[PDB]
Assembly symmetry: D3
Homo-oligomer: 237 residues x 6
């Protein structure tokens, strides 16, 4: 057990799905996993382990922000034998052609955080996902007949940005979505030799904001989870 | 209600104590406040309001890391009329003469985050606490007979830092405790016009690795709470 | 005609292969393309346009370094309607398990250059390739019975760096190859909305000089061009 | 004797007041100290020692700018046993509600200098004053019946700044006064192990341009001196 | 032989002229040098060695950009005993009083590149030419009845910069011409203890396109080569 | 009159010699100027105006550090019509072949200050002297039969550097001397359109330190002044 996870080696599957909200982890466990058991509850960051179509899978929250998710993914990788981490969250869109409920896959993640410069001697470290994992996710999406865009995400340190000028910049350089952790997770994955992937559903449009129905948003969130779960099965083959 | 807090103006007191752990907030509400009511549970970030010696007080967790607590402190200030925020967290010590369960008051907070450089045109912003609040905390401690060092804290983005030599640099400059929020809260307090102070209890020693050996509080982590609550009363008079 | 390309709209195909060595441009047109015609000679940077299995394709060198290739790729995209750019070059390896003559595909590219920071408000822009282009290259190689590594490349501004320790850092973070263009090309593609990919052959193993024949080099080089050319057709399908 | 001070251990009191102007030091020695003796004149930086109500005290100018005062404060601490340094200077106001001759106490000091980044591995060092000294100054002011704001100062490298919009940024973050030494002195105090505090008298208003109109002191610049001297006595008790 | 130059010690003179356009190398050997012989062809970068009025001299292009010229100048200095490097190229002007076809000598070179910061601990290294070489060029021009401007050049990493405002800044600080090599060459010369100079002809006036004949261009170009060649002889005297 | 100079237009010559020490200005005035009168004494920074061989010349101190000398040179240029500034000071040497009493001329000046980045949009501004002034100084030196090296100086913000690693770096890149203001003065000269030059005599050897006789050091200091004064006369022709 670690300071943030009160569990023991074996308690987690070698693959962990991670939403930002801990309550969302219980929701995932309850909806898609069979014979699921709770394996952590320290600081309320609920974690579960069960099976998906006979495949052992875990799901646990990582909180908001790079500093927060950096702690959990690191401990899982170095103390619980986790080989793959899949973040499943939400994001805001800046590009006009990107609509609400769009499923985005971050093959890369930009950031205003300084954590990767600290690791990479003040230089530019391209925070990227594991290729095979992105490929498995894209294929799983196609099988479920779901679009899915693959590109850059932007991991912000400030949800409430002091100067909203970066949004024009993000849009200019093709950023698909704005969230708060992909760059941190990709950084730890590279630092401790593991594999990670971030998938998001567009929950708003920075400028436009727009709106839809709850039943439809909830349907789209489940598609994301199904894509994540099915991508793991393809990876096993 | 705000994007991360489902409450209305009036649900929170003008003063809020904030530990990083929502379960510590719950404990604080159950142990020190009377007629405590839960006012928030979104994303599991439990928030409570009650009274301490007739004084209306609130206590809510803020999660781990600057990006996380920046969201919560901001929403409380702009949408719930919160005038004062007192962080009651834990920290790691780097100085040889700093023992576990020691209480520190951060009049200042150093950091390796980029959030304040982003607010201050890439220059050095001295993230400092409110002077009167620091003074109230000092007097509250003396009256309670609890020792408490006043000085600089260091707000880290990476709990598992790649740069171990930076701790030597921290020690050389007299850093009293390493945590993950102070500089960020002080930045928000200044950006949105509110007052803040960070009080911490040494829970780990980065050198000796002696972690929170021997319980998790029982009295000291309670000491921190007594000082915070009593300092608030001095501020009212 | 542009400052560095004396040609008109239509002279270049929507897809262009670009070697670092300008002499390789004519070699490719002669060895792999049919009905090739010269389309540029300014500053001795010979450009050719022809067809590969009916598909229109162009080839022209970009010169060594980010500044140089940034010029050509930009002019090609904004003034000659180019939609995809494939850099075909060489790199040095820092990972012991990455062998000489290995074919690596850069899904991402790290760098010590300032160009992207100038474009991204001094933040971390993740310079990445176009996902489909990466997958096309991986599949084309497999079909050619060639094993290919997909990962991060490092684009150095200084071939003769005074910072020897940086090679240890690159290895620790899994950098597959060191070259001098990818990050610059990926920045341009993002800035002007185009697609790009860099494929490199391991020409040497930094800190471990090993020998290789001239017959082997041509063979590996021809393999890389075949991989790139076949990848374009898959991209069309 | 040190490279810039021709005196011997014992010539200075363990506490030294330092205005940027050597002529102000002379004035202070002649007006407030008894049996004042000149202990230095190298480069014209006049230094004096005498007593205030029986308490041994010294007063020496430090020149304009961080590089200048960094030299003098360092030499005093390492070669003359000086334990406390109180800067008594002038500053420019950016806030609309700050009037000429107002007294400010810098509990913290922001800066555009690079000296502290050079000491703190390019991270953010919160340049702060000694808490007890700040408190002594506050009490000394109350007892004397002099108003005094406690907060952040901004230590500028360029008195004639090219960046005028930075003043708006300073105002937004509540900077009480703009001067040129505080952050540097606090850095030295921390590096060489001593205590410091900066007290300033508003001499200019950067917005209204109303400079030190109406004399150069007569009583207020004397107020600053009374507070400094009296705060020292409180510290001894 | 070096990675980019297939020659041996002695093939190059101790002085080398370097145009950005590789095609100009053969033109110079044919038009100004006597008994020229080819000494390099790797990557199509033709190098020649001959004599001018008995003085041994070599000429070879460096390619566009700091990264490219840094390679060649370095190899020439460390492996071919070269002592002086004179870059002869073109530049764009931002000062209205600097006319088209003007000859400018860069005593210093500003830059937006990171190469020198990597060499100088992230501090400001002033990339300067060799004083005697500057004076030799000024005197040679005067003797040729040509007026020459000596001052600062700006070496840009991006010919197509997204930061349009930077040209206003360069003008305000007196930048005589904008090119893409000088600062890199000056860094190399300083790093390996050699002498260097950059001479450029104003080929265009940024933000003010003006016309010029092809006969005029050759004339000005020949003038620059004569200035450079005659400067070497003065340097010998 | 300005806040730092109590004089009026006409009081200073259009050429001003500036030592760091104000007492050294009186010394220069007394030793080389005829009919010299004091024109400033604010903050003890003595300034004088007299004539040298019929040429009107001024001499005034600038204090230690870039922030200090930046204030004076700026006011002289924009408020007193000064066209040329010549700093005449001392410096420490890092290069072995540079000896005590060597006369160094800084055609360029590196620095760890941030003032030029603030002016040059965070880029590299090569802080250089005016060419004609360097040329006049070199020629004046030759006429007086004095050696004089021309090259880079290093303007340090910290006389007492926290980490003496930069000295090896300075030595590696050929820095002739270490002082504390040239880069600041060259920056203001470029900002307000004036001309400046810095000349220094080596007063110590960072590592070696060495030693000589006072009579000889004083002779060398006078040679420097004579070189400065005579250089002005050549400039008039
Ligand atoms: C619009 C926007 N900006 C930043 N983060 C966003 C976002 N929309 C969603 N997120 C994500 C990432 C965080 O974990 C959380 C913040 O509410 O949801
Ligand atoms: C070593 C280290 N670094 C950063 N924060 C640390 C730490 N040891 C303890 N902490 C503290 C601060 C956080 O608020 C908390 C996170 O678990 O513990
Ligand atoms: C070992 C090494 N380092 C940097 N760039 C390298 C390299 N080996 C090959 N390259 C590539 C990229 C450049 O375009 C060129 C430099 O010789 O070949
Ligand atoms: C506008 C401005 N900037 C920086 N320092 C200023 C200022 N106006 C006044 N000062 C103060 C601080 C110094 O200690 C002193 C220098 O003359 O005046
Ligand atoms: C306008 C402009 N900008 C940048 N570099 C320029 C230029 N005009 C000429 N050059 C020079 C330097 C490069 O080597 C090449 C770029 O076309 O010519
Ligand atoms: C060794 C050394 N380092 C930094 N500055 C030096 C120096 N020797 C002389 N100086 C100069 C510049 C300052 O104005 C003053 C500092 O004593 O002398």
């Amino acid at each position: 057990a670690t300071p943030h996870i009160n569990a023991e080696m074996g308690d987690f599957a070698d693959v962990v799905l991670m939403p930002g909200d801990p309550l969302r982890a219980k929701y995932i466990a309850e909806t898609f996993l069979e014979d699921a058991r709770e394996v952590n509850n320290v600081r309320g960051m609920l974690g579960f382990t069960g099976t998906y179509k006979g495949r052992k899978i875990s799901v646990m929250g990582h909180g908001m922000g790079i500093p927060s998710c950096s702690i959990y993914t690191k401990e899982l990788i170095t103390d619980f034998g986790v080989k793959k981490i899949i973040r499943v969250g939400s994001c805001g869109a800046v590009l006009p052609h990107v609509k609400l409920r769009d499923v985005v896959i971050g093959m890369g993640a930009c950031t205003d955080s300084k954590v990767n410069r600290i690791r990479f001697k003040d230089h530019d470290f391209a925070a990227i996902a594991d290729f095979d994992m992105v490929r498995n996710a894209v294929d799983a999406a196609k099988a479920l007949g779901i679009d899915a865009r693959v590109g850059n995400l932007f991991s912000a340190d400030l949800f409430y940005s002091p100067d909203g000028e970066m949004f024009d910049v993000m849009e200019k350089y093709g950023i698909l979505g704005v969230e708060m952790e992909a760059a941190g997770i990709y950084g730890v994955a590279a630092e401790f030799g593991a594999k990670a992937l971030t998938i998001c559903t567009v929950s708003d449009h920075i400028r436009t904001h727009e709106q839809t129905t709850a039943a439809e948003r909830q349907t789209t969130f489940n598609d994301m989870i199904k894509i994540a779960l099915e991508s793991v099965l393809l990876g096993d083959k």
